[PDB]
Amino acid sequence: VXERCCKNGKRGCGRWCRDHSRCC
């Protein structure tokens, strides 16, 4: 888990990515 942010880039940045993703 944690791929959506860096994978979607502009589409991955969000509250979930903010907590589960390193980028954004």
Short mmCIF file of C-alpha atoms in Angstrom, two decimals:
data_model
loop_
_atom_site.label_atom_id
_atom_site.label_comp_id
_atom_site.label_asym_id
_atom_site.label_seq_id
_atom_site.Cartn_x
_atom_site.Cartn_y
_atom_site.Cartn_z
CA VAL A 1 0.00 0.00 0.00
CA UNK A 2 1.17 3.62 -0.49
CA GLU A 3 1.55 3.52 -4.31
CA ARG A 4 -1.52 5.62 -5.32
CA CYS A 5 0.15 8.94 -4.36
CA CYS A 6 3.50 8.70 -6.23
CA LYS A 7 1.79 6.52 -8.90
CA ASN A 8 -1.00 9.00 -9.67
CA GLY A 9 1.21 12.04 -8.95
CA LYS A 10 -1.33 14.88 -9.16
CA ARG A 11 -4.08 12.24 -8.75
CA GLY A 12 -2.31 10.51 -5.85
CA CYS A 13 -1.82 13.63 -3.66
CA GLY A 14 -4.57 13.64 -0.99
CA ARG A 15 -5.37 12.93 2.71
CA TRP A 16 -4.74 9.19 2.12
CA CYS A 17 -1.40 9.74 0.38
CA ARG A 18 -0.56 12.44 2.96
CA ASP A 19 -0.78 9.67 5.62
CA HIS A 20 -0.06 6.44 3.66
CA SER A 21 2.27 7.84 0.95
CA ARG A 22 5.78 9.33 1.34
CA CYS A 23 5.45 11.88 -1.50
CA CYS A 24 2.78 14.61 -0.97
#
